[PDB]
A paper describes a structure:
Secretagogin is one such EF-hand Ca2+-sensor expressed exclusively by endocrine cells of the pancreas, adrenal medulla, pituitary, gut, stomach, and subsets of neurons in the nervous system. Secretagogin is built by three domains (denoted here as A, B and C), each comprising a pair of EF-hand motifs. In mammalian secretagogin, domains B and C undergo conformation changes upon Ca2+ binding, and form a surface groove in domain C for the docking of both SNAP-25 and syntaxin-4-derived peptide ligands. Here, we identify secretagogin as a molecular switch between syntaxin-4, a protein facilitating the movement of reserve vesicles toward the active zone, and SNAP-25, a core member of the vesicle fusion complex.
When testing for pairwise interactions by coexpression, copurification, and size-exclusion chromatography, recombinant human secretagogin also bound the GFP-SNAP-25c chimera in the presence of Ca2+ (noting that mouse and human SNAP-25c are identical). Thus, recombinant human secretagogin together with the GFP-fused SNAP25-derived peptide could also be used in X-ray crystallization aimed at resolving the structure of ligand-bound human secretagogin. We determined the X-ray structure of both mouse and human secretagogin bound to the SNAP-25-derived peptide ligand at 2.35 Å and 2.30 Å resolution, respectively. In both cases, GFP carrying the target peptide (155-GIIGNLRHMALDMGNEIDTQNRQID-179) as C-terminal tag was employed whereby the large globular GFP module served as a crystallization chaperon that was necessary to obtain diffracting crystals. The P212121 crystal’s asymmetric unit contained two copies of the protein complex, wherein the secretagogin molecules were identical; superposition results in a Cα-rmsd of 0.54 Å and 0.66 Å for the mouse and the human proteins, respectively. Even for GFP-mediated crystal contacts, its interaction with the SNAP-25c fragment was limited to 1 and 2 hydrogen bonds for mouse and human structures, respectively, making the target peptide freely available to secretagogin. The electron density map allowed us to model a 17 AA-residue (155-GIIGNLRHMALDMGNEI-171) and a 16 AA-residue (155-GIIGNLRHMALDMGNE-170) section of the SNAP-25 peptide for the mouse and human secretagogin complexes, respectively. Contact points between secretagogin and the SNAP-25-peptide were dominated by hydrophobic interactions (155-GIIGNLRHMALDMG NEI-171, polar interaction/hydrophobic-stacking). We obtained similar values for human secretagogin with a buried surface area of 886 Å2, accounting for 50.9% of the total surface area (1,740 Å2).
Residue numbers in the entry:
A (entry chain D): 12 to 69, 78 to 276
B (entry chain A): 2 to 64, 68 to 247
The structure:
Amino acid sequence: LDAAGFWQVWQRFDADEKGYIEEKELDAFFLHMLMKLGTDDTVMKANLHKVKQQFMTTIRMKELAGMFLSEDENFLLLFRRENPLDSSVEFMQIWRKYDADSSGFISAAELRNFLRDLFLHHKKAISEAKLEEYTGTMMKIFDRNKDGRLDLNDLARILALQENFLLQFKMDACSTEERKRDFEKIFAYYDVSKTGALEGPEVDGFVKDMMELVQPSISGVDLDKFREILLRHCDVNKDGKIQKSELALCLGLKINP
Amino acid sequence: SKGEELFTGVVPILVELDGDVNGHKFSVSGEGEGDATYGKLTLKFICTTGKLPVPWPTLVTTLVQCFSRYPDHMKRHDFFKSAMPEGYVQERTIFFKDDGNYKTRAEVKFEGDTLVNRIELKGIDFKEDGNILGHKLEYNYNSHNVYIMADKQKNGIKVNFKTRHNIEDGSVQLADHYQQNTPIGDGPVLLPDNHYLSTQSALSKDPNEKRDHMVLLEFVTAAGTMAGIIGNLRHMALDMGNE
Ligand SMILES: [Ca+2]
Ligand SMILES: [Ca+2]
Ligand SMILES: [Ca+2]
Ligand SMILES: [Ca+2]
């Protein structure tokens, strides 16, 4: 049993990643899973029993992953699930890092590099053969249109990227103090390097979050396209960065910082 | 505000005007309904003293802005509903360019289940063959912006706008409105940020009404106010994505 096979089984019950299944799905889950391991009708009721028991003696994905997968394949499915990426800026630093040819998509070879570094980071030596196998499994799990490359949103799901930070802000918070508070929250979030201007991946993350307020999840090529457009709109000094004072004026902030 | 919940659905309306223009006395009675969720008004008025000595279009702004639609994000700016049900005083001077003026005082309030607008109007200095007393206005109405500012000292709002009345020779007659609204009650009201109301109205006749009368349909929505930051972001995002 590999992560992809477990994932395909998990799909029947949790297609949109609640992260769990329900207690009367459980038996049908073991059934279907046990069916997947190629199990005989003669051994079914016992294996089901033993399995149910082990679990009872121990419904979220981590629990079913530990039973049916190796520690390296659990890692693949849960390395971020326990530690989701909180910042879209950090996300785009990773994206830029691994989209080394700037094609706007993560190819199989770039995914392999991502995973090599990932395993080294968690101080885990895996063979070259498993590196290849895992790249293939990850691709299969996360390549939605099976076209052989990973899109922006696909890496986002691999990294368990949290909700768009911008979605917390509301139309009716319209007072000057409300808008100033929210503007400061926003700029603190994107200006990770605390330079007073959004640069490189800080722009990226802001562009992604802004465009996804009004469009379905955007592609890597569209990001670069919208980044240019946003800069042509708001980059008053034309230095390739968004100074706070430029973002503030472009968002209608009453008092320019 | 609590007043806002009074306008949830369809609300019946009554209007009474006692008028005097260059000594010509007249009275108008109106009825209809308001549906503020749609910024929607439907009203019929009749002159009960005989013929009206001024054009119906000159009386349209005098003869219930508590029926304007306020988008959800501008609700804290709706003065007119906030004064309800005790109501408000609406005072105006309307200066018709190159002619006389109206001075009006209205109380707008709930009287039981009905929104009632009671007005007194005085008109002076009108030229006897000018556009108003000559009846040279076309029977129609244009679309305007009504600009609203808070008046904190009066616990109310000051309101200014110009209406454009088509003349039958093809010119336009301007009427310059100076408006003040004051709560009648001691209850708390909502003082708005600067904004405006955008209006559109159509005039018609009831074929089965023998008296001098006007039928009026109007749509009114507020606008102009800063929304939350998310508003600016959303609208910028929209434009960045064109083409
Ligand atoms: Ca690439
Ligand atoms: Ca793909
Ligand atoms: Ca920065
Ligand atoms: Ca700049």
